[PDB]
Amino acid sequence: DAIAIVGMSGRYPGARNVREYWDNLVHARNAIRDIPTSRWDVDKYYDPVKVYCKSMGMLDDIEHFDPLFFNIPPSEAELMDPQHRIFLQEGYKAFEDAGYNARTLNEKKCGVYLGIMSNEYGVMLNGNSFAIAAARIPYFLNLKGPAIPIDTACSSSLVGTHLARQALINKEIDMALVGGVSLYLTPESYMSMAGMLSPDGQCKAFDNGANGFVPGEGAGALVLKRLKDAEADRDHIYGIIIGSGINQDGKTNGITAPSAKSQMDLERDIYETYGIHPESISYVEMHGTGTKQGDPIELEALSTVFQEKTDKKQFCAIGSVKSNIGHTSAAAGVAGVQKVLLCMNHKTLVPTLNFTTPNEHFEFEHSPLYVNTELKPWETADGKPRRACVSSFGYSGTNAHIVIEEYQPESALFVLSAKKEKQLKAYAEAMKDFVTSNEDIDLEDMAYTLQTGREAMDYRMAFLADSREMLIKALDDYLAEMPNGSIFAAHVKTKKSEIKLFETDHDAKALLQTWIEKKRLEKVAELWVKGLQIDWNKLYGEYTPRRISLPAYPFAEEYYWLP
Amino acid sequence: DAIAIVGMSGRYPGARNVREYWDNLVHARNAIRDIPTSRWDVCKSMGMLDDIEHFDPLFFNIPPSEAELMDPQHRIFLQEGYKAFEDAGYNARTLNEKKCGVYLGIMSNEYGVMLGNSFAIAAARIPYFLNLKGPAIPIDTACSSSLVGTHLARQALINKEIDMALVGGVSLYLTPESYGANGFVPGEGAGALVLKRLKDAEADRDHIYGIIIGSGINQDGKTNGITAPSAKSQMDLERDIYETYGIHPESISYVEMHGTGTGDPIELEALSTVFQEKTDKKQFCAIGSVKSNIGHTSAAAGVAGVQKVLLCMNHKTLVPTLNFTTPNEHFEFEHSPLYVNTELKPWETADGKPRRACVSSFGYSGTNAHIVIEEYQPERSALFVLSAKKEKQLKAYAEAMKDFVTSNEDIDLEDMAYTLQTGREAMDYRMAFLADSREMLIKALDDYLAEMPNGSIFAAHVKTKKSEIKLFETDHDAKALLQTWIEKKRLEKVAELWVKGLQIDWNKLYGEYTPRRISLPAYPFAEEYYWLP
């Protein structure tokens, strides 16, 4: 039936994580920049009539990787496509976002469906097959569900989402990591213009001045489960997929042209199959690439299918995040899904950019659709959950469209750990920023997530706090190395002897068990940082807190490029 | 529920088509040759396709100059895919707007680099050409690719998301760079199957090679090195499939192993162990690997194996697996459910139970697939028509048909004509003839080819005869006359008119005996050379 999205991670132009992503969207920020010479020299390729676009939505630090974390020899890292490296990182972080770790994921029937469409690094070198890109994560975490790379161009990650959904409903897998990654490493590839690119370097979605897209880079991942399982397992749930479908354009006027009829059929068939009324939908994240013939075809298709079922006008807002971050290709689908989920969570619609005058080839006034350029409340009538759609169409003609519904649910001991002390410090910094920015965080949920939702690694710190202010101060004290009697820290490898007593003696175990049961947190803390295994469940009686979204591992930022 | 395989086409080392493939397997032929200098200057061996440069771009509305810029993997699959449809008895007209998915196994980019050529486009060629509307997805899970595709197509059909699927694989080895048990020898190939829900296949009166009654995919996960196999994952895969779909290992009498000749002992132990969990019976299940004949055809491995199994079932015959002198030391056969078949023998079944077989395909990236196939058990002059887009190809078509009829003494003449009528597109260059026997049929085709006048033979180029058939297209009594001819007997008249371009309603030729579509030779593409520009 319904598929729950229980974890996410994203890395897009101007946004290192989904929290920065959200911030950028709320502020109507455009992340498209001129391509710097540190990538390539645009002057050596630029001709206005060769490349005619000099702009890109770029990721920062595409060379950065933490190979040691993944048990990969540093020298192998140079030989890995950065698309592989970056997704490995984001994919892992999506699991942690959900509150799953290596221990809890071991041997899980989790499928991995990875959108990927380019091979630039592999060619530059002359390990780097699409098949291996997909299999990295299963190999690292010992997952047992199928590992399939999807190249349907720009629809890739959404097609992957459809396949994962169907495998989940058919009970073939019990979890799914779906995602996409796209980088533009060479003048040659980004180049193919074929007439595709905008000379102004903007995706002017829906606008009469639409004249092509600007290429964008990104990597994103979602964690999917059946809704029934997610509720049983007490996952935190961003929203639910209540319908999806894929199809083909078939014969068009040129293989990269879109088909109005195919887009209509796709959308109609989904709504009919899953009993979804267009009136129930209040936002659609369009493919919306800002191409002159593509945009009006998409609009007319969607409008027509909505209008077959309703006379209501201008009830459904439309937009495209490609207006913010450019066309992130293989990652386009997952980028749009993440936007919609964030909107739903915050009950807020955000502006679509670059829209001055409506495309002349489509009349909005008597349409169910309207272009939203406002940051406003996402209003819903009565009790009803918000619903939104995401469309992704590829240049090869394979289309995807999904429907998302809002999910409507019915002192603490803080622990942190990392594989290196430097990353532990980075972790504490990320947590402090997170707490600082999120004034309403449930402290008990947060502690619980750090306890049960993260792997205990070799460098550890822990502290007590009963308020946001106390939590912030502890992290500050830790970072500043300024003495605080409630802060504990150790490297586990150095503290084996000091712990052995509680691991072997029967009465020491009984005393530790009594400590945990009576909530003697200082004592639990001191032992935990030294490497003692704590049974966290025992910390909680009638009331158990819930896993929530927190910042994920802060990978070492080590530079690897061509050998 | 069950998925019917209703069309197939194949092009493997030593075999231009599935009939030659079968013949090679029956005769235990090995297609592995030394790599010639025309490929590159030299392991020095490969299972090679012939004339990988040949394509018929005009057939596919592709400009000849674009053909040079196409990965031959794309070009060859386009041809084999199309022929799979024709094998099933479907044509451009009958496929138009069909919800047919295309799932294409592909795992290399050599031509593109040597130089449009994305995996995404490779899958989309056929949908674009035939106006199909099911999703077009390329699958790169390495050597499991085509079998992974089969699984996905199967699930989509069962969920009713599509009504037909073309599944296939293609693998070429173009560069030196990308290149007892001692490892594998690389093979080249392209194969395709046409899949439908069984209920539809029977209602539509398709010819059915066999049915897929169970499939699964999974991962190795964490192994000792990313390309190492996991005994446990193989077992879980096989067990889960058999349990989910209610398949008893005792019912299975052949398994086409992944069997790359490296890995071997792990596969043997896994399958053996799973079988033994459910039965004490010994040496009931033959095992083989067509990789012993044609090499490791990579992305096309799965489809090559599935086609072998279907051909075996169709002929109720097991064929030899090659290169086997003494059993792998690391596995003990004597008390196993498994035995290596090295004989050409009858495939025996007990009390009219359908034969069942499995195909395994495991990838170097750790994505595994396994499917279970069951044998399908089904409950006067004719008018033969042929056509092609050029006269040269019509001649080649006639030769292919003559060879086919010569080779098949038991062909049903009514079925064959019926397939030529309803199961092929009537193109611009046409010939037709009457025959009431195999001998007459062979004679007619001989006469046509040798240009010996024969009063039963009619031929025309349709563009030349427009003025001559107008008399029949619009007038009401001319249609009545034609309908009286085709309703019903004179066939000579229908024939003359058909070759000149008149559209015939083939259904009217048949009152309540209607013959069935059968497998026949598909289009003989023009063999034009295209390579790097």
GROMACS .gro file of C-alpha atoms in nm, chain B residues 86-440:
model
  355
  649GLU     CA    1   0.845  -1.075  -3.555
  650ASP     CA    2   0.921  -1.420  -3.414
  651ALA     CA    3   0.620  -1.381  -3.184
  652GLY     CA    4   0.416  -1.272  -3.488
  653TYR     CA    5   0.372  -0.903  -3.413
  654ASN     CA    6   0.441  -0.614  -3.648
  655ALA     CA    7   0.475  -0.235  -3.651
  656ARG     CA    8   0.098  -0.200  -3.689
  657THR     CA    9   0.005  -0.436  -3.407
  658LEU     CA   10   0.265  -0.295  -3.168
  659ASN     CA   11   0.179   0.071  -3.223
  660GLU     CA   12   0.096   0.232  -2.887
  661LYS     CA   13   0.126  -0.098  -2.701
  662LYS     CA   14   0.217  -0.073  -2.333
  663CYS     CA   15   0.533  -0.274  -2.390
  664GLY     CA   16   0.826  -0.231  -2.151
  665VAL     CA   17   1.184  -0.264  -2.274
  666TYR     CA   18   1.444  -0.398  -2.030
  667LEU     CA   19   1.793  -0.408  -2.181
  668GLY     CA   20   2.102  -0.563  -2.021
  669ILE     CA   21   2.411  -0.364  -2.115
  670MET     CA   22   2.744  -0.315  -1.941
  671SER     CA   23   3.001  -0.146  -2.166
  672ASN     CA   24   3.069   0.181  -2.349
  673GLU     CA   25   3.364   0.097  -2.572
  674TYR     CA   26   3.246   0.250  -2.900
  675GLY     CA   27   3.136   0.580  -2.746
  676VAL     CA   28   3.484   0.623  -2.597
  677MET     CA   29   3.657   0.517  -2.920
  678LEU     CA   30   3.462   0.798  -3.087
  679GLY     CA   31   2.361   0.928  -2.862
  680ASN     CA   32   2.544   0.633  -2.708
  681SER     CA   33   2.409   0.631  -2.352
  682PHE     CA   34   2.259   0.321  -2.191
  683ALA     CA   35   1.939   0.525  -2.163
  684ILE     CA   36   1.918   0.566  -2.541
  685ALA     CA   37   2.018   0.205  -2.610
  686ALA     CA   38   1.703   0.088  -2.434
  687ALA     CA   39   1.493   0.359  -2.598
  688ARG     CA   40   1.578   0.276  -2.960
  689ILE     CA   41   1.307   0.012  -2.999
  690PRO     CA   42   1.030   0.205  -2.822
  691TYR     CA   43   1.113   0.506  -3.042
  692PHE     CA   44   1.103   0.300  -3.360
  693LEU     CA   45   0.787   0.104  -3.280
  694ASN     CA   46   0.602   0.365  -3.072
  695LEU     CA   47   0.593   0.154  -2.756
  696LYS     CA   48   0.468   0.311  -2.435
  697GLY     CA   49   0.603   0.091  -2.156
  698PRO     CA   50   0.910   0.214  -1.968
  699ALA     CA   51   1.247   0.170  -2.137
  700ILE     CA   52   1.517   0.087  -1.882
  701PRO     CA   53   1.876  -0.027  -1.935
  702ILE     CA   54   2.011  -0.263  -1.669
  703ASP     CA   55   2.379  -0.279  -1.577
  704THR     CA   56   2.422  -0.535  -1.303
  705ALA     CA   57   2.714  -0.685  -1.496
  706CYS     CA   58   2.661  -1.045  -1.604
  707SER     CA   59   2.325  -1.081  -1.428
  708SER     CA   60   2.187  -0.792  -1.630
  709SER     CA   61   1.948  -0.965  -1.869
  710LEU     CA   62   1.811  -1.189  -1.594
  711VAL     CA   63   1.760  -0.892  -1.362
  712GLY     CA   64   1.570  -0.732  -1.651
  713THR     CA   65   1.359  -1.046  -1.683
  714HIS     CA   66   1.264  -1.025  -1.315
  715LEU     CA   67   1.164  -0.660  -1.338
  716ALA     CA   68   0.958  -0.716  -1.653
  717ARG     CA   69   0.792  -1.012  -1.483
  718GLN     CA   70   0.690  -0.801  -1.183
  719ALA     CA   71   0.559  -0.519  -1.401
  720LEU     CA   72   0.345  -0.759  -1.606
  721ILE     CA   73   0.204  -0.922  -1.293
  722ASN     CA   74   0.122  -0.582  -1.148
  723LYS     CA   75  -0.045  -0.494  -1.479
  724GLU     CA   76   0.173  -0.187  -1.533
  725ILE     CA   77   0.260  -0.316  -1.880
  726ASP     CA   78   0.091  -0.567  -2.109
  727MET     CA   79   0.407  -0.687  -2.284
  728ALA     CA   80   0.782  -0.679  -2.225
  729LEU     CA   81   1.086  -0.707  -2.449
  730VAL     CA   82   1.373  -0.830  -2.233
  731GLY     CA   83   1.728  -0.870  -2.362
  732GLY     CA   84   2.104  -0.836  -2.331
  733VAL     CA   85   2.389  -0.726  -2.554
  734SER     CA   86   2.765  -0.748  -2.503
  735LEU     CA   87   3.055  -0.677  -2.738
  736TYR     CA   88   3.428  -0.676  -2.663
  737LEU     CA   89   3.568  -0.410  -2.892
  738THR     CA   90   3.901  -0.309  -2.737
  739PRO     CA   91   4.216  -0.483  -2.612
  740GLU     CA   92   4.186  -0.267  -2.299
  741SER     CA   93   3.858  -0.415  -2.175
  742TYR     CA   94   4.010  -0.761  -2.200
  743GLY     CA   95   4.039  -2.794  -1.458
  744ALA     CA   96   3.849  -2.468  -1.414
  745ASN     CA   97   4.080  -2.177  -1.484
  746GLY     CA   98   3.865  -1.868  -1.538
  747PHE     CA   99   3.628  -1.774  -1.820
  748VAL     CA  100   3.670  -1.681  -2.185
  749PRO     CA  101   3.482  -1.363  -2.283
  750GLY     CA  102   3.191  -1.402  -2.524
  751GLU     CA  103   2.984  -1.168  -2.738
  752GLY     CA  104   2.609  -1.186  -2.795
  753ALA     CA  105   2.270  -1.024  -2.829
  754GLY     CA  106   1.939  -1.185  -2.732
  755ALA     CA  107   1.577  -1.088  -2.674
  756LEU     CA  108   1.259  -1.246  -2.536
  757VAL     CA  109   0.899  -1.128  -2.570
  758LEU     CA  110   0.699  -1.173  -2.250
  759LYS     CA  111   0.327  -1.159  -2.173
  760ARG     CA  112   0.089  -1.263  -1.897
  761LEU     CA  113  -0.004  -1.624  -1.971
  762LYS     CA  114  -0.378  -1.551  -1.974
  763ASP     CA  115  -0.330  -1.287  -2.244
  764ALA     CA  116  -0.099  -1.512  -2.448
  765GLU     CA  117  -0.364  -1.783  -2.460
  766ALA     CA  118  -0.650  -1.542  -2.536
  767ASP     CA  119  -0.439  -1.384  -2.811
  768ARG     CA  120  -0.345  -1.727  -2.947
  769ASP     CA  121   0.028  -1.656  -2.933
  770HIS     CA  122   0.276  -1.941  -2.970
  771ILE     CA  123   0.434  -2.006  -2.636
  772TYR     CA  124   0.790  -2.129  -2.581
  773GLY     CA  125   0.749  -2.180  -2.206
  774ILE     CA  126   0.638  -2.005  -1.888
  775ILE     CA  127   0.822  -1.829  -1.606
  776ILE     CA  128   0.678  -1.955  -1.277
  777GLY     CA  129   0.929  -1.800  -1.037
  778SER     CA  130   1.207  -1.541  -1.025
  779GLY     CA  131   1.415  -1.349  -0.772
  780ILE     CA  132   1.707  -1.112  -0.732
  781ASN     CA  133   1.930  -1.031  -0.435
  782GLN     CA  134   2.278  -0.916  -0.331
  783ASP     CA  135   2.592  -1.088  -0.207
  784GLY     CA  136   2.644  -0.798   0.033
  785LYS     CA  137   2.972  -0.798   0.223
  786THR     CA  138   3.204  -1.056   0.069
  787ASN     CA  139   3.582  -1.101   0.073
  788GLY     CA  140   3.642  -0.853  -0.208
  789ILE     CA  141   3.355  -0.700  -0.402
  790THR     CA  142   3.371  -0.954  -0.686
  791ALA     CA  143   3.369  -1.264  -0.465
  792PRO     CA  144   3.052  -1.475  -0.444
  793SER     CA  145   2.849  -1.550  -0.131
  794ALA     CA  146   2.733  -1.909  -0.086
  795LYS     CA  147   2.475  -1.785   0.163
  796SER     CA  148   2.319  -1.528  -0.071
  797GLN     CA  149   2.288  -1.782  -0.352
  798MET     CA  150   2.115  -2.025  -0.115
  799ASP     CA  151   1.881  -1.759   0.024
  800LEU     CA  152   1.796  -1.645  -0.329
  801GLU     CA  153   1.709  -1.997  -0.442
  802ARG     CA  154   1.528  -2.099  -0.123
  803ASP     CA  155   1.318  -1.782  -0.112
  804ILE     CA  156   1.209  -1.824  -0.474
  805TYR     CA  157   1.111  -2.188  -0.428
  806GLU     CA  158   0.922  -2.109  -0.107
  807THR     CA  159   0.747  -1.795  -0.232
  808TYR     CA  160   0.624  -1.966  -0.549
  809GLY     CA  161   0.563  -2.316  -0.413
  810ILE     CA  162   0.829  -2.490  -0.620
  811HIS     CA  163   0.962  -2.825  -0.498
  812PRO     CA  164   1.323  -2.896  -0.594
  813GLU     CA  165   1.223  -3.251  -0.692
  814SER     CA  166   1.021  -3.105  -0.981
  815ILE     CA  167   1.332  -2.947  -1.131
  816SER     CA  168   1.529  -3.159  -1.375
  817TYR     CA  169   1.769  -2.909  -1.532
  818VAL     CA  170   1.964  -2.607  -1.410
  819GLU     CA  171   2.154  -2.377  -1.645
  820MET     CA  172   2.430  -2.267  -1.409
  821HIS     CA  173   2.610  -1.934  -1.406
  822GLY     CA  174   2.897  -2.172  -1.444
  823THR     CA  175   3.174  -1.942  -1.563
  824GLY     CA  176   3.448  -2.199  -1.499
  825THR     CA  177   3.629  -2.011  -1.224
  826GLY     CA  178   3.306  -1.971  -0.807
  827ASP     CA  179   3.200  -2.302  -0.960
  828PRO     CA  180   3.222  -2.499  -0.633
  829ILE     CA  181   3.036  -2.233  -0.435
  830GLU     CA  182   2.751  -2.235  -0.688
  831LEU     CA  183   2.738  -2.616  -0.687
  832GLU     CA  184   2.734  -2.639  -0.307
  833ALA     CA  185   2.469  -2.369  -0.271
  834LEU     CA  186   2.221  -2.519  -0.517
  835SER     CA  187   2.292  -2.873  -0.395
  836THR     CA  188   2.235  -2.770  -0.033
  837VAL     CA  189   1.903  -2.600  -0.110
  838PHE     CA  190   1.776  -2.900  -0.307
  839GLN     CA  191   1.885  -3.141  -0.033
  840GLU     CA  192   1.686  -2.950   0.229
  841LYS     CA  193   1.375  -3.082   0.055
  842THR     CA  194   1.472  -3.417  -0.100
  843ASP     CA  195   1.689  -3.724  -0.048
  844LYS     CA  196   1.668  -3.810  -0.419
  845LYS     CA  197   2.006  -3.840  -0.591
  846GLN     CA  198   2.130  -3.732  -0.934
  847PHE     CA  199   1.788  -3.641  -1.072
  848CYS     CA  200   1.881  -3.289  -1.182
  849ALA     CA  201   2.113  -3.235  -1.478
  850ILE     CA  202   2.332  -2.925  -1.476
  851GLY     CA  203   2.503  -2.745  -1.764
  852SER     CA  204   2.641  -2.413  -1.884
  853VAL     CA  205   2.619  -2.279  -2.239
  854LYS     CA  206   2.926  -2.071  -2.153
  855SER     CA  207   3.115  -2.391  -2.231
  856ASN     CA  208   2.994  -2.354  -2.591
  857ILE     CA  209   2.993  -1.980  -2.658
  858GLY     CA  210   3.200  -1.823  -2.379
  859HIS     CA  211   3.087  -1.570  -2.118
  860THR     CA  212   2.849  -1.346  -2.305
  861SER     CA  213   2.829  -1.102  -2.015
  862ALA     CA  214   2.521  -0.877  -2.024
  863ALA     CA  215   2.363  -1.130  -2.259
  864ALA     CA  216   2.447  -1.433  -2.044
  865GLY     CA  217   2.104  -1.462  -1.884
  866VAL     CA  218   1.910  -1.444  -2.210
  867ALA     CA  219   2.147  -1.690  -2.378
  868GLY     CA  220   2.077  -1.940  -2.100
  869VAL     CA  221   1.702  -1.889  -2.095
  870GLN     CA  222   1.694  -1.945  -2.471
  871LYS     CA  223   1.896  -2.266  -2.440
  872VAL     CA  224   1.651  -2.396  -2.179
  873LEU     CA  225   1.344  -2.311  -2.387
  874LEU     CA  226   1.496  -2.481  -2.692
  875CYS     CA  227   1.571  -2.789  -2.483
  876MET     CA  228   1.211  -2.800  -2.358
  877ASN     CA  229   1.068  -2.747  -2.707
  878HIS     CA  230   1.269  -3.040  -2.843
  879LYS     CA  231   1.234  -3.238  -2.522
  880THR     CA  232   1.611  -3.289  -2.539
  881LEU     CA  233   1.905  -3.229  -2.307
  882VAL     CA  234   2.233  -3.131  -2.472
  883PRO     CA  235   2.597  -3.172  -2.364
  884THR     CA  236   2.782  -2.924  -2.149
  885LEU     CA  237   3.139  -2.902  -2.273
  886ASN     CA  238   3.497  -2.914  -2.145
  887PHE     CA  239   3.412  -3.154  -1.861
  888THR     CA  240   3.652  -3.443  -1.802
  889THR     CA  241   3.675  -3.475  -1.422
  890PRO     CA  242   3.456  -3.320  -1.150
  891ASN     CA  243   3.577  -3.020  -0.952
  892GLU     CA  244   3.763  -3.160  -0.651
  893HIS     CA  245   3.580  -2.917  -0.421
  894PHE     CA  246   3.242  -3.076  -0.480
  895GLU     CA  247   3.114  -3.432  -0.443
  896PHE     CA  248   2.855  -3.524  -0.703
  897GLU     CA  249   2.789  -3.886  -0.615
  898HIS     CA  250   2.546  -3.812  -0.331
  899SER     CA  251   2.418  -3.486  -0.474
  900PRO     CA  252   2.081  -3.415  -0.640
  901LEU     CA  253   2.296  -3.284  -0.924
  902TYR     CA  254   2.479  -3.450  -1.212
  903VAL     CA  255   2.673  -3.297  -1.501
  904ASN     CA  256   2.507  -3.394  -1.829
  905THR     CA  257   2.755  -3.453  -2.112
  906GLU     CA  258   2.515  -3.649  -2.333
  907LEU     CA  259   2.279  -3.556  -2.612
  908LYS     CA  260   1.972  -3.740  -2.483
  909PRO     CA  261   1.594  -3.729  -2.441
  910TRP     CA  262   1.482  -3.504  -2.156
  911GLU     CA  263   1.270  -3.748  -1.960
  912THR     CA  264   0.972  -3.656  -1.744
  913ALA     CA  265   0.750  -3.874  -1.525
  914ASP     CA  266   0.374  -3.916  -1.573
  915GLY     CA  267   0.324  -3.623  -1.811
  916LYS     CA  268   0.447  -3.363  -1.567
  917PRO     CA  269   0.581  -3.053  -1.739
  918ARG     CA  270   0.959  -3.022  -1.748
  919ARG     CA  271   1.099  -2.755  -1.517
  920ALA     CA  272   1.439  -2.585  -1.529
  921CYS     CA  273   1.624  -2.300  -1.358
  922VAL     CA  274   1.863  -2.035  -1.489
  923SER     CA  275   2.115  -1.866  -1.259
  924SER     CA  276   2.307  -1.547  -1.336
  925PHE     CA  277   2.546  -1.380  -1.092
  926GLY     CA  278   2.723  -1.048  -1.145
  927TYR     CA  279   3.067  -0.930  -1.040
  928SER     CA  280   2.900  -0.642  -0.853
  929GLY     CA  281   2.714  -0.895  -0.640
  930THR     CA  282   2.364  -0.860  -0.781
  931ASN     CA  283   2.223  -1.209  -0.836
  932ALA     CA  284   1.929  -1.348  -1.033
  933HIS     CA  285   1.756  -1.685  -1.064
  934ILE     CA  286   1.448  -1.782  -1.260
  935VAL     CA  287   1.233  -2.096  -1.283
  936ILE     CA  288   1.093  -2.196  -1.623
  937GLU     CA  289   0.820  -2.454  -1.686
  938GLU     CA  290   0.745  -2.630  -2.016
  939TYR     CA  291   0.415  -2.513  -2.167
  940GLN     CA  292   0.156  -2.782  -2.239
  941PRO     CA  293  -0.106  -2.665  -2.491
  942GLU     CA  294  -0.454  -2.817  -2.519
  943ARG     CA  295  -0.625  -2.744  -4.995
  944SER     CA  296  -0.408  -2.456  -5.121
  945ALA     CA  297  -0.269  -2.192  -4.887
  946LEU     CA  298  -0.164  -1.840  -4.984
  947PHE     CA  299   0.196  -1.756  -4.902
  948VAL     CA  300   0.302  -1.391  -4.889
  949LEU     CA  301   0.642  -1.228  -4.841
  950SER     CA  302   0.756  -0.866  -4.846
  951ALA     CA  303   1.063  -0.652  -4.780
  952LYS     CA  304   1.171  -0.288  -4.806
  953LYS     CA  305   1.412  -0.363  -5.091
  954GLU     CA  306   1.405  -0.632  -5.359
  955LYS     CA  307   1.745  -0.765  -5.248
  956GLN     CA  308   1.602  -0.832  -4.902
  957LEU     CA  309   1.290  -0.993  -5.046
  958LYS     CA  310   1.522  -1.238  -5.222
  959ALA     CA  311   1.707  -1.305  -4.896
  960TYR     CA  312   1.370  -1.349  -4.724
  961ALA     CA  313   1.265  -1.611  -4.978
  962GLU     CA  314   1.594  -1.797  -4.932
  963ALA     CA  315   1.549  -1.795  -4.553
  964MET     CA  316   1.198  -1.936  -4.589
  965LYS     CA  317   1.310  -2.209  -4.829
  966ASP     CA  318   1.590  -2.319  -4.596
  967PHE     CA  319   1.342  -2.318  -4.308
  968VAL     CA  320   1.085  -2.532  -4.491
  969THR     CA  321   1.357  -2.766  -4.619
  970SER     CA  322   1.487  -2.810  -4.263
  971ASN     CA  323   1.141  -2.862  -4.113
  972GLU     CA  324   0.958  -3.150  -4.279
  973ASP     CA  325   0.665  -3.127  -4.038
  974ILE     CA  326   0.573  -2.761  -4.089
  975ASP     CA  327   0.199  -2.690  -4.087
  976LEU     CA  328   0.144  -2.509  -4.417
  977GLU     CA  329  -0.176  -2.333  -4.306
  978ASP     CA  330  -0.010  -2.201  -3.990
  979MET     CA  331   0.289  -2.074  -4.188
  980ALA     CA  332   0.079  -1.889  -4.446
  981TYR     CA  333  -0.137  -1.751  -4.164
  982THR     CA  334   0.174  -1.616  -3.992
  983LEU     CA  335   0.300  -1.461  -4.316
  984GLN     CA  336  -0.039  -1.299  -4.370
  985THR     CA  337  -0.117  -1.167  -4.022
  986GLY     CA  338   0.219  -1.174  -3.846
  987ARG     CA  339   0.429  -0.970  -4.087
  988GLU     CA  340   0.405  -0.611  -4.211
  989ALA     CA  341   0.319  -0.587  -4.580
  990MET     CA  342   0.605  -0.377  -4.716
  991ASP     CA  343   0.676  -0.227  -5.056
  992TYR     CA  344   0.837  -0.517  -5.244
  993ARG     CA  345   0.602  -0.813  -5.257
  994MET     CA  346   0.576  -1.170  -5.375
  995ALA     CA  347   0.299  -1.424  -5.321
  996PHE     CA  348   0.215  -1.777  -5.436
  997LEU     CA  349  -0.016  -2.073  -5.378
  998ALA     CA  350   0.098  -2.415  -5.261
  999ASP     CA  351  -0.089  -2.722  -5.135
 1000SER     CA  352   0.217  -2.917  -5.019
 1001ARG     CA  353   0.567  -2.881  -4.875
 1002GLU     CA  354   0.708  -2.989  -5.211
 1003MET     CA  355   0.508  -2.731  -5.407
   0.00000   0.00000   0.00000
